[PDB]
Design a binder for this molecule. Sequence first.
Ligand SMILES: NC(=O)C1=CN([C@@H]2O[C@H](COP(=O)(O)OP(=O)(O)OC[C@H]3O[C@@H](n4cnc5c(N)ncnc54)[C@H](OP(=O)(O)O)[C@@H]3O)[C@@H](O)[C@H]2O)C=CC1
Ligand SMILES: NC(=O)C1=CN([C@@H]2O[C@H](COP(=O)(O)OP(=O)(O)OC[C@H]3O[C@@H](n4cnc5c(N)ncnc54)[C@H](OP(=O)(O)O)[C@@H]3O)[C@@H](O)[C@H]2O)C=CC1
Ligand SMILES: CCCCCCCC
Ligand SMILES: CCCCCCCC
Lengths: 265, 265
Amino acid sequence: EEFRPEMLQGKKVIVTGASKGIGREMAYHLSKMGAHVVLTARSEEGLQKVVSRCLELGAASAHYIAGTMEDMTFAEQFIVKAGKLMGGLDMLILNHITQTSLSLFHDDIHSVRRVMEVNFLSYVVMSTAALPMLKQSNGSIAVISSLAGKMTQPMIAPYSASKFALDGFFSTIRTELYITKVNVSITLCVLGLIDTETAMKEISGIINAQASPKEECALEIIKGTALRKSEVYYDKSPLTPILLGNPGRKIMEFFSLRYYNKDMF
Amino acid sequence: EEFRPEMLQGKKVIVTGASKGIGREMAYHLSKMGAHVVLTARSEEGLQKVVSRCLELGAASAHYIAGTMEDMTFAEQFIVKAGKLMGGLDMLILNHITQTSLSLFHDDIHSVRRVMEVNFLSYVVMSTAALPMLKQSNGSIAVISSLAGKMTQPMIAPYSASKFALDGFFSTIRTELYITKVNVSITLCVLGLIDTETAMKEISGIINAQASPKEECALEIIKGTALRKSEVYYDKSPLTPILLGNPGRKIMEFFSLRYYNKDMF
Ligand SMILES: NC(=O)C1=CN([C@@H]2O[C@H](COP(=O)(O)OP(=O)(O)OC[C@H]3O[C@@H](n4cnc5c(N)ncnc54)[C@H](OP(=O)(O)O)[C@@H]3O)[C@@H](O)[C@H]2O)C=CC1
Ligand SMILES: NC(=O)C1=CN([C@@H]2O[C@H](COP(=O)(O)OP(=O)(O)OC[C@H]3O[C@@H](n4cnc5c(N)ncnc54)[C@H](OP(=O)(O)O)[C@@H]3O)[C@@H](O)[C@H]2O)C=CC1
Ligand SMILES: CCCCCCCC
Ligand SMILES: CCCCCCCC
């Protein structure tokens, strides 16, 4: 199976955190492929610029709904509104996160909660609300994560906890959908350092690593999700996918199912 | 180095989720070794029975403070009170969990939030509140997890997400303590199916597998934490630790540290 930009022509796609960074780049790529898109983020001014650029790029349709993912009711209602605007949904791309800064963890529990709320909870809420429509189109969900969701590095404990949580939850959902024969795919995207101005600003004077181009990253996420792959790794080093792939875990998961009462699903 | 019960003689230890299961068995073990102990759980009546048995068993002292870990203030204050009571803290064992039954996930968002609150948030709250005392005695922290915190299995998405989150948060904390030269150890205990009433009852008719004895499990957790091991695996199969150990991750974490500005530590 090889990718062809035709696979997204006419598709109905939602993209969160599309105001800038990887999100904005995915909007552009989806637009050049003739897809229908609905974007979201906090700033209405920023969303308007990208939506304009989207039609200008060939988007079969482009719209935006500004709001904060800290509000679960908004996250939930966002999905249904987007669904109505496009008359369905083929692909959901959960990409947004809350403002994170690098620092050794001290206290600030309220910060950890906000991180788990926006980075994790809003994702389960949106995926839950979008599943009905996704089941109708045998759609897909792309969950944006990072190396920090597969490994540990200092100064990002909260962020790291939220990304690990995403793997735990959605990997379970993926196998439940598959075990109950529902044709909806879940692609976890493991991203290394990307040259977004947010990232660069944040690791300045702290991290030395080389960053990858945000445009190609955006493309690989689209490709892997359209190809219904379980996981997509994108990092400068070709060793990252092999060192973080965890083949031992795959073996354990396969054999674990043999203990379940097959009548439960 | 090898373990010797004398390593806990006189040690000041906190154990959550101590009214039953593995937590109760840990209380009995710490007691026989002559440790000071303060237990917690929701059942006041239940805690009473165990603290009494602890004194009989030979505890240097034993107290209990009933409460719900769904309350972040009760969680942080439980640690301060317990600390005052023993005059310090040597070991913190985070073992409590909110209720969860096996079931294919659907849309129980309030449950998910509750699970992350109890299973994860309260844990960071307590570890934060306890760290100052642990720093004075170069103490340890044991965070109880399960196979579901290293791998994925159907019907426990919420639980699994909270356990993955613990790995991400605490492995970061562990490495941060280490690079700043603070001598406090963090032991993640990965448990297979344990022979507790709650477990056996919850998997009935759903999962058919062999469980390990709760008493030996408790003893291994204590020995591992006492020896300051980073991780402890306790399961039927001797292959489990190897398959879930993720050596690739350990390699990636080692190499990534090289890109950090050591002045920040
Ligand atoms: N850049 C990198 O190096 C790496 C990035 N990633 C992953 O990429 C994804 C995007 O990263 P990146 O492009 O760098 O991030 P950005 O900060 O550039 O983008 C974040 C997006 O989320 C939106 N947003 C921020 N706060 C909230 C909120 N409370 N509610 C709703 N929306 C919000 C932003 O719009 P607005 O602020 O206007 O709301 C923005 O469009 C994430 O899931 C991230 O963890 C992974 C590895 C590396
Ligand atoms: N048994 C097994 O197969 C396995 C167990 N484990 C791990 O072991 C630990 C507990 O072991 P297990 O014996 O199975 O669990 P149990 O359900 O038997 O014990 C749970 C403990 O948590 C307490 N608890 C329950 N609800 C709350 C709450 N809202 N606030 C504070 N405390 C609460 C209980 O006290 P009370 O009800 O009075 O509040 C009890 O003392 C967990 O951390 C778990 O993930 C891991 C893998 C397998
Ligand atoms: C969550 C308790 C069940 C774990 C099942 C283990 C199958 C090897
Ligand atoms: C915030 C994530 C930084 C990743 C740096 C590690 C490079 C392999």
